[PDB]
């Protein structure tokens, strides 16, 4: 009922046969750095080339796939993370 944004789950939009509208919502805590999308084709002797997109563009488009073919994809999230060592118990006698 106020300012309390939880973790947003990934979602897909503009889905096609040879193209898809991959979209994700980065976490305010998640480091803001360009991400890399990896894709692998099974109906080809060689996989499709990856792509690098800035973090600001939580969305990206990948076309050139083939229908009826098994395409292996992988969404890797590379982020540094927030400052570690928040609050814990300090050892002391």
């Amino acid at each position: 009922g106020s300012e309390v944004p939880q973790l947003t789950d990934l979602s897909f939009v503009d889905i096609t046969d040879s193209s898809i509208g991959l979209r994700w919502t980065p976490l305010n805590s998640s480091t803001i750095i360009g991400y890399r999308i990896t894709v692998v084709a099974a109906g080809e002797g060689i996989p499709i080339f990856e792509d690098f997109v800035d973090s600001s563009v939580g969305y990206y488009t990948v076309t050139g796939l083939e229908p009826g073919i098994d395409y292996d994809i992988s969404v890797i999230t590379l982020i540094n993370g927030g400052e570690s060592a928040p609050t814990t118990l300090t050892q002391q006698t």
Binding site: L10, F12, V13, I20, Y71, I73, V75, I76
Partner: peptide
């Protein structure tokens, strides 16, 4: 809005990665 198909998050390799069968089905 409801999507044709949706998977889930998987914890592995000391990292969070999203994987599944293949591209968006139907």
């Amino acid at each position: 809005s409801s999507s044709p198909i949706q998977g889930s998050w998987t914890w592995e390799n000391g990292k969070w990665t999203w994987k599944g069968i293949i591209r968006l089905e139907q």
